[PDB]
Amino acid sequence: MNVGIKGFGAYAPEKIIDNAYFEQFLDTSDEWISKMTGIKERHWADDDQDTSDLAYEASVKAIADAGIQPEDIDMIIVATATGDMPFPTVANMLQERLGTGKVASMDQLAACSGFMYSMITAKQYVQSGDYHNILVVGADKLSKITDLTDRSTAVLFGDGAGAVIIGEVSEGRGIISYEMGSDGTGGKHLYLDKDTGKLKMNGREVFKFAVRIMGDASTRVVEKANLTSDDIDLFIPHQANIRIMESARERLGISKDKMSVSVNKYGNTSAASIPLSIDQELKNGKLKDDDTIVLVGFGGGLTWGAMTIKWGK
Amino acid sequence: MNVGIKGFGAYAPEKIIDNAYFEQFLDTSDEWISKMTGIKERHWADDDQDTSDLAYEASVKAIADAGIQPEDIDMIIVATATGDMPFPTVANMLQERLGTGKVASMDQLAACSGFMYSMITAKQYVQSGDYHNILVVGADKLSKITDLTDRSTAVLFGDGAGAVIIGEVSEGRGIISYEMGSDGTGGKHLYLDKDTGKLKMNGREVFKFAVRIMGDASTRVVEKANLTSDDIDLFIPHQANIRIMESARERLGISKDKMSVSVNKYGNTSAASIPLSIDQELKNGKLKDDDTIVLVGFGGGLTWGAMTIKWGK
Structure with a gap:
């Protein structure tokens, strides 16, 4: 179904x-x-x-x-x-x-x-x-x-x-294709310090993995979905760092103006990042029924996800 | 399947x-x-x-x-x-x-x-x-x-x-029938105090809930499976406390010698409770292939679940 x-x-x-x-x-x-x-x-x-x-x-x-x-x-x-x-x-x-x-x-x-x-x-x-x-x-x-x-x-x-x-x-x-992944080896680069209770990050390490995973994972769900960069109406990635985003947008190979960008007003909101960005495109009338959007993200774990879905009820 | x-x-x-x-x-x-x-x-x-x-x-x-x-x-x-x-x-x-x-x-x-x-x-x-x-x-x-x-x-x-x-x-x-439920009104009876970082429990309120929910949910999964306490080989409940376990077993109306008990040597191990008890029945020779058991537990939240599952690879 x-x-x-x-x-x-x-x-x-x-x-x-x-x-x-x-x-x-x-x-x-x-x-x-x-x-x-x-x-x-x-x-x-x-x-x-x-x-x-x-x-x-x-x-x-x-x-x-x-x-x-x-x-x-x-x-x-x-x-x-x-x-x-x-x-x-x-x-x-x-x-x-x-x-x-x-x-x-x-x-x-x-x-x-x-x-x-x-x-x-x-x-x-x-x-x-x-x-x-x-x-x-x-x-x-x-x-x-x-x-x-x-x-x-x-x-x-x-x-x-x-x-x-x-x-x-x-x-x-609906959901056409998707992908999930884990890589426990990078946990040290981004975790919650047990004692202090605060998040710890190694920017450079995190940055290098981020640009790659988001780029490649997106490419994978798109091919799996058998889509062409023509069928992509919106590319909505985890709003983690404009530079990380552009790099992945670039890797996927998609029009600079198809990317949702809301990191400028929200920053990195982890699991809310993608939805908070889809909310923008919707109320700015740039996302509509039957449009096909590409989702991709990654977080401390390291974990990652990518989805391909055609909007509409 | x-x-x-x-x-x-x-x-x-x-x-x-x-x-x-x-x-x-x-x-x-x-x-x-x-x-x-x-x-x-x-x-x-x-x-x-x-x-x-x-x-x-x-x-x-x-x-x-x-x-x-x-x-x-x-x-x-x-x-x-x-x-x-x-x-x-x-x-x-x-x-x-x-x-x-x-x-x-x-x-x-x-x-x-x-x-x-x-x-x-x-x-x-x-x-x-x-x-x-x-x-x-x-x-x-x-x-x-x-x-x-x-x-x-x-x-x-x-x-x-x-x-x-x-x-x-x-x-x-494998799994024949199940029931996962939730009830947030009981969150006050069992939670992790933010400031203190220690578990807080209202004994009576959890006791009352536990007994009722385990007994009732077990009865439902069994009935949903079109079975009777007779067909059940083992009743394996969350080893939360021996008194809470017996009360439920009495409610379910299953044979006293069908209930798996390991709380005696492990105490309450939360998520590990039921699997830890299954491990004991396996080696004591009480659980075997084609046997039909009933898992049921409850937890802070509140949450509860119950499964009817015929053992065997």
Whole structure:
């Protein structure tokens, strides 16, 4: 059967943080940051607003956009590396708060590739035929695990949440191809320091793997889908670093103007990155039914994901 | 198709802690901890040994018992609430440490019910026809999140790991029926306190829920399977506490000598609970090919699950 996105929702906190905000406690500057990452500002959730709070907002919209009631949700999967707690999970909270049925709800960790993994995981259940609507969320409150003494990561991450309803869609539309991967050998280059509680990154190592995986993984899902660079209406990669993005956009070999770019206003929001970017293209009327979009991302693990899907309910 | 367990393995740390150990800092006694929990002793991983390490040990056994090589694994799903770090995930670490391919690998959060969730997640992936040997793990080092000044839970939790390879089994064996559920209103009765980093539990509220949910869900999966307590060879519940286990067994109305009990030597090992108990029945000669068992558990969240599965490769 054809399984796709029949409902979409996104959300970014209200507090906007400009690049000029780090000059006070870091050797940075708008010029530097903009040049190095292509970021101009990011969104940060308040102290009393955790990952579940963002996840909740993103979910409510995708439920209305799918044109269904929360009672119709057959399962909840929240992709996040920053859940409020390991238990109860963010999905457990969405179950009660969304007023859904007492269906299965879990968070699956795959970092920045998490959303595609969950999106793909949901497809597997919907194909079993016993599941019609699965709520998939990609949410992260990275600001709470960001080291503000390490300018290369401090000025890089933001918070945000994205969400969709995976279920069967009209024929010809939906998920066409996808790819998931792991490489435990690169975990040391990007992890959460057990003691300190802060994220650790080796920019140069992470950078080199990022440009390659996102480039190649995308190429793979496109060929698997048997598509031509002509059939690609939008290339929506993990908004990790404008330079990483361009490099991968370049590797894939696709028009510079087909790439979704929202890293300038959100920064790197891990699992929310892709949905937060699809939200832009939708409300700027640049993504429409029957358009074919290419998804790709990677995160600390190292993990990666790539998807090919024709938009439409 | 018939999807079941084609390889099994379990592990528990070398350090065994006697009930009398807690007398030096808690007002307890062997008789008291027994009377209340039925636990006699449990295992605690070493200071330099994390969930990863436990997961690893069971995985090696599970792959060897399956009769395959690490290069045959198509995916790696790790169920835990005490993973080393949110990223990389325990799964990512196994991918490497196991010398597996660069296959998909992620951790899934559903507390003590996660192991069942994950086995089902794998079922869905195998039913697609694209996956054949999915390494699923149940691991937890509850000891690092247990508050020893709270004898309530201090004497309850222990560490350990369980693992299985999910694939296609013969002679119409494997998973017959299942039920995964969730209920976020109980999140307050069992959560990881953010500030303190220690597990917080409301005993009575969890007890009440546990007994009811295990008994009821078991009855449903059996009935959904068109069976009776007679056809069930073993009733293997989350070894959360001997008193909670008997109450459920009484509700399910199954034979007292059909219930698998291992809490006595492991205590509560969360996700590892059921696989750790299956390991005991296998070697004591109580579980054999073509036997029909019933798995059921519950956890913080709250979550719960139940499976009816005919043993056999």
